[PDB]
């Protein structure tokens, strides 16, 4: 029975549970790598005495946090658990394919760990640019194992995207139009469309890198008439959609959390929120070369990419203001999930604004490949995504488990995390403005003070992570079972109890047309 249930699953809730467990474990790996980065930088000089290993650690940190922590948790975990429940559907459209999207991830992760164990690892950056990633500067198996890891992760997500689009389009109650579905469901649909279109391009590019390394092609090798910059275009054509993929299901969860703890039946400006996510998804495909402003690009192309990038601020600002307008007039419940969402709103806004600074290609000449970029994306991505994940986790943990958390402990956890991430990343802005490069294992002496503070900050977030594991333990240890939950009339995923039965909506909901 155990094998049938947990290895042969065709159930959206159990598969969602698997993804949450996987993503949590990956988050530990990613956190450990981040602490090694900041230990190397925590005082001037060398710690590891081996900068190839430092580069492998940086590269792995990013792949783990992006492909094995954020995407599995948000889309595989919350997506599978919540989307069928929010539309009253009995499961996903392809419940057995769903299980393969999950099981491709442990092998993908094994390939990445194999990459770091053989030879001297792939010390490339998560961008894996040739020629550094090619077969002369990175001879041997590590980069190919990394490429295959991305292939399996890509197939997992493309098939999951097919499943989510099909489920959301096809499996709603017959009276429910797309404009009657909850915003989290919209955020997952739009993320899936982005995955569907962007991951095949990444797969094309890294397959060309694979054949350059092993079949004597020369797509990226000037000796054969190739061009390293072509790889960058194919990578970032995927890579900008990818950063919106990382945040969009977070935007969906934030809309639900803010609505819920404001005591509201609905988010402010529902169709504006739909419009804004679709607009962000669309603009997300026409901005990628702002990752390439220093490669030798013509001035009119820089002007276009500067302007198109900045436009994204308009739909994003509609969502920020609409979350504020959802708080407006609320009977505010200061639950731990609410604290995570309010932290999200502020810290995402800071990071988004530093992105607007970087969009100005004239300033990006000086800021590109410095810690200002690192500060930008650890605010919007690392904090934005992580705070939405933590807020969702604390909010829905009683739905998934049937048990409550200790709210006081959860508030303590929030407070510690909030101090840690801000101490870690806020000084990196100074480091970037004053010209410290990213991807360095050591720095000129003038940069010591902010590096020292940033590394001390990283230990505070470590203490928060350890505390979070204890808080989950304490909840499962004490077994406070849920009795009553407010606002079920506008939060359908709670209406089948906690946890819901294995099969839900065997009899579908009744919804009239009128």
């Amino acid at each position: 029975m155990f094998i049938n249930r947990w290895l042969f699953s065709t159930n959206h809730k159990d598969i969602g549970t698997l993804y949450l467990l996987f993503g949590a474990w990956a988050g530990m790996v990613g956190t450990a790598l981040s602490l090694l980065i900041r230990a190397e930088l925590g005082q001037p000089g060398t710690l590891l005495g081996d900068d190839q290993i430092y580069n492998v650690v940086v590269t792995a940190h990013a792949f783990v946090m992006i492909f094995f922590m954020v995407m599995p948790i948000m889309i595989g975990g919350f997506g599978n658990w919540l989307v069928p429940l929010m539309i009253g559907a009995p499961d996903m459209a392809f419940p057995r394919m769903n299980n393969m999207s999950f099981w491709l991830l442990p092998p993908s992760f094994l390939l990445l760990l194999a990459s770091s164990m053989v030879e001297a690892g792939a010390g490339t950056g998560w961008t894996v640019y040739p020629p550094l990633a090619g077969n002369l500067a990175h001879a041997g198996a590590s980069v190919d194992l990394t490429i295959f890891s991305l292939h399996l992760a890509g197939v997992s997500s493309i098939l999951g995207a097919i499943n989510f689009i099909t489920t959301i389009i096809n499996m709603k109650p017959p009276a429910m139009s797309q404009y009657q579905t909850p915003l989290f469901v919209w955020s997952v649909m739009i993320t899936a469309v982005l995955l569907l279109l962007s991951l095949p391009v990444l797969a094309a590019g890294i397959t060309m890198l694979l054949t350059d390394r092993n079949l004597n092609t020369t797509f990226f090798d000037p000796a054969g008439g190739g061009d390293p910059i072509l790889y960058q275009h194919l990578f970032w054509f995927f890579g900008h959609p990818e950063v919106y993929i990382l945040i969009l299901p977070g935007f969906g969860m934030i809309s639900h959390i803010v609505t819920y703890y404001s005591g509201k039946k609905e988010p402010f400006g529902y169709m504006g929120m739909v419009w804004a996510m679709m607009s962000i998804g669309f603009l997300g495909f026409i901005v990628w070369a702002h990752h390439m402003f220093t490669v030798g690009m013509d001035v009119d192309t820089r002007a276009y990419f500067t302007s198109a990038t900045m436009i994204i601020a308009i739909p994003t600002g509609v969502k920020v203001f609409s979350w504020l307008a959802t708080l407006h007039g609320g009977n505010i419940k200061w639950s731990p999930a609410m604290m995570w969402a309010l932290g999200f709103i502020f810290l995402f806004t800071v990071g988004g604004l530093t992105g607007i600074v970087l969009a100005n290609s004239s300033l990006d000449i000086v800021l590109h490949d410095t810690y200002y970029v690192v500060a930008h994306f650890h605010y919007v991505l690392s904090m934005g995504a992580v705070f939405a994940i933590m807020g969702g986790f604390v909010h829905w943990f009683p739905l998934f488990s049937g048990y409550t958390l200790n709210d006081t402990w959860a508030k303590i956890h929030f407070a510690i995390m909030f101090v840690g991430v801000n101490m870690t990343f806020f000084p990196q802005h100074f480091l970037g403005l004053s010209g410290m490069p990213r991807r360095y294992s050591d720095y000129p002496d003038a940069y010591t003070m902010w590096n020292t503070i940033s590394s001390m900050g990283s230990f505070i977030s470590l203490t928060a992570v350890m505390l979070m594991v204890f808080i989950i333990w304490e909840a499962f240890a004490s077994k406070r079972e849920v009795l009553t939950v407010d606002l079920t009339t506008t939060n359908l995923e709670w209406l089948n109890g906690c946890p819901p039965p294995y099969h839900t909506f065997e009899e579908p909901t009744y919804v009239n047309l009128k």
């Binding site: 155990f2 947990w6 698997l18 474990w25 790598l33 290993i53 164990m117 946890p499």
Partner: protein, 46 residues
């Protein structure tokens, strides 16, 4: 059919909180420890 209900919709046991503590320690602790030991491995190769 399958077990339903709190504590039963999961692939690990919560029947005993100390055995659970040991399982969670090994689970999260193995993920956290792995990069330290991979770095150790790469340093020991040369």
């Amino acid at each position: 059919h399958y077990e339903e209900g709190p504590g039963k919709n999961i692939p690990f046991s919560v029947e005993n909180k100390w055995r659970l503590l040991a399982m969670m320690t090994l689970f999260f602790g193995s993920g956290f420890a792995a990069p330290f030991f991979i770095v150790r491995h790469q340093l020991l190769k040369k």
